[PDB]
Design a protein around this ligand. Sequence first.
Ligand code: ZN
Ligand code: ZN
Ligand code: ZN
Length: 572
Amino acid sequence: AVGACVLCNSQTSLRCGACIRRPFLCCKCCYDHVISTSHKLVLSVNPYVCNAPGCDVTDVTQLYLGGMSYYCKSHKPPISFPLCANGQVFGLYKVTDFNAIATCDWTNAGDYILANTCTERLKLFAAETLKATEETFKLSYGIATVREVLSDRELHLSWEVGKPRPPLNRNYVFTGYQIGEYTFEKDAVVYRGTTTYKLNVGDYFVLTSHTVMPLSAPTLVPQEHYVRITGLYPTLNISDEFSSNVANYQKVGMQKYSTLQGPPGTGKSHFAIGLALYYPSARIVYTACSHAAVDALCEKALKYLPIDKCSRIIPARARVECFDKFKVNSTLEQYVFCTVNALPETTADIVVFDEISMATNYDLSVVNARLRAKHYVYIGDPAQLPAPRTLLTKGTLEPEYFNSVCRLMKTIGPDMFLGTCRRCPAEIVDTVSALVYDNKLKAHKDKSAQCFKMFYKGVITHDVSSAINRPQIGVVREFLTRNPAWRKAVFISPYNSQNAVASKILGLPTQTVDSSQGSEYDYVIFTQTTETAHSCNVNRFNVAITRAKVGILCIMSDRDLYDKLQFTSLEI
Ligand SMILES: [Zn+2]
Ligand SMILES: [Zn+2]
Ligand SMILES: [Zn+2]
């Protein structure tokens, strides 16, 4: 019961018993917390509760020290001192932002703004409190039980009465009962078991509620600037392919950490792998939140780096299939590719943390705690999508609040910016450059004259709250009959239910905007589906149209984003 104050470090025996994370608070800080919030339970070796038999006074502001014990006003001896006096709470070794983080329910955007604008120690308290709240919320959902199994990919479910039903998308991962992790897609539902198992009737599924470990490391280590490249030894013979990044690679070696904003198709993986070639003896750990981001770095490394010095770290509790071409779980290979949640405790010359817009402060801290490195390079784009905030329902989370790295990129600017999009036709580049990049993103490709837009509101139906627009899919079907090259297009929309309908009617492969992030396709067909905050989000819109290498068709619901698209308009 002895520790350091989460607000000012001052040693104490006090912890707030009303806070879900029970943070250590020093006398001057514990007082400022109890006296300004509904939190009145204070914990020491023994709690601050009335020692008198049968008394239920637990409020610290109504308690006094009667010798060596604690008593309320009704039970205190004549010679007693109040626990709360002269701006402090009695304890050994004798905040407006801390109060809001400690008492908020994480359903408002302002709660996330505070968690990213507060002091460093309060960023860890906020990240731990938020993650713990997100887990206890998983318990609120009802259990799903198998009523009947139709096929190897379809079943019928029986839900728990009195408890709400979680959304049925790829985002919500269930645990079968331990028959492996399972996902569902919309009376027949589509099941996807991570482990192939003959679904038994009576078996049940629950969302995996995991224990939130405490955070110790900052989201960002303190910044250091050096006069020379430190702890890294550059090649003199550097491949022409990577010459464009030489100044940026030198910047990387002359700072403790560096941020790289890379818009779509500007060379983020190329930059990341080129760093290994520029500092050929450096041990580099490549990390990201998702298996897909880690695998994309592996694919790029497979092409430029010696395969024998690479290793893909995979947790024994395998959830999805991932990269197979490197030796698995060899922590000491020069190049280690691993998701944040699976990181071993190791050191490195450089840590490259990719797809930074998807990281949370919880992830930023975990990386600093598991990896001790000479240099940290954060790669991503605050104009792309953040990690879903399951509890957030009110307000929009702006990019400067996604995490500490995105906050830096949006306030002081990134240390490095990849300014030339090599993927997209110029119509797409020009649109997103003006939309989210302050006209700093340049097109490498010419206009393809295969980027089309159509303003068609159609009809919005809903599968619970996930939206469908059949008339927008009908417009796509008509377009496909006249444009056979587009037969190979990937269908993209902001909604899983829109994608499920489009899959049956069009037969095109399907992706939500969020799942398409990091991927590229020659042709993309996008149906906005609705005019909601979700489907109009500029970061989601940016990701949606930058998936295309050759052509894109956008069937739009929103006049604003439609008018912004620098595409050829189609009639009907
Ligand atoms: Zn303090
Ligand atoms: Zn508290
Ligand atoms: Zn009492």
